[PDB]
């Protein structure tokens, strides 16, 4: 609603490792790949394969665990035939998320801004915080994605305000360059980037609406 007397009118947040942390739903989503291509389970202690989860795209997670020839095609038809809907439920919200939301309703417009195409307004209504953005962002919503700066362009429109009247809270290098290019002042959440501010917990957001 825009109550706050600061210069600040939205914040706009970053859905993976700022909202909520979806490793577990990752892990459980290639575990379930192995038992159906009755392939050993990945283990949490193996350095090398979690590695491959947290940096690896989804298609190059496949054919790295996939390499004899035919099982590629058969784990994408696995992938395919999971209901992504019943790994929601495994992301882990970050922690005092929805408590800043609360501190910030009414007080300023909010925001998603994600590079999503499908599941994005999935999470929000199965997390109930779909009563707090006016703007949701996603791939699917625009024709081009973080790091280019549409996505935050319309979010500007949608409140009618300037780029310097808002702020963008992300935790990766592309959620930084499109702020750049937009001229949104850069929130970093728990990540080394060079922003106008950073984060350590969600509480912070209430003291950097000035
Ligand atoms: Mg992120």
Redesign the pocket.
């Known amino acids: 609603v825009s109550s706050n007397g600061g210069a600040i009118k939205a914040v706009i947040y ?5 909202m909520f942390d979806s490793f577990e739903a990752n892990l459980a989503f290639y575990q379930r790949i192995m038992e159906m291509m009755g392939r050993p389970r990945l283990s949490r202690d193996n350095e090398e394969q979690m590695r491959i989860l947290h940096t690896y795209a989804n298609r190059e997670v496949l054919a790295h665990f996939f390499p004899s020839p035919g099982d590629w095609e058969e784990a994408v038809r696995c992938a395919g035939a999971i209901d992504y809907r019943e790994l929601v439920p495994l992301m882990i919200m970050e922690e005092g998320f929805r408590e800043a939301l609360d501190t910030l309703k009414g007080r300023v417009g909010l925001g998603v801004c994600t590079n999503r195409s499908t599941s994005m307004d999935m999470v929000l209504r199965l997390f109930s915080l779909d009563s707090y953005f006016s703007i949701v962002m996603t791939a699917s919503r625009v024709t081009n994605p973080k790091p280019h700066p549409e996505p935050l362009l319309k979010v500007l429109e949608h409140f009618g305000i300037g780029p310097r009247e808002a702020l963008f809270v ?3 290098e592309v ?1 930084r360059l499109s702020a750049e290019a937009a001229g949104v002042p850069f929130v970093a959440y728990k990540a080394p980037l060079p922003a106008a501010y950073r984060m350590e917990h969600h509480r912070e957001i209430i003291d950097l609406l000035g």
Request: hydrophobic share 10%; glycine share 22%; aromatic share 0%.
């Open positions: 970053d859905c993976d490792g700022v992300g935790d990766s959620d």
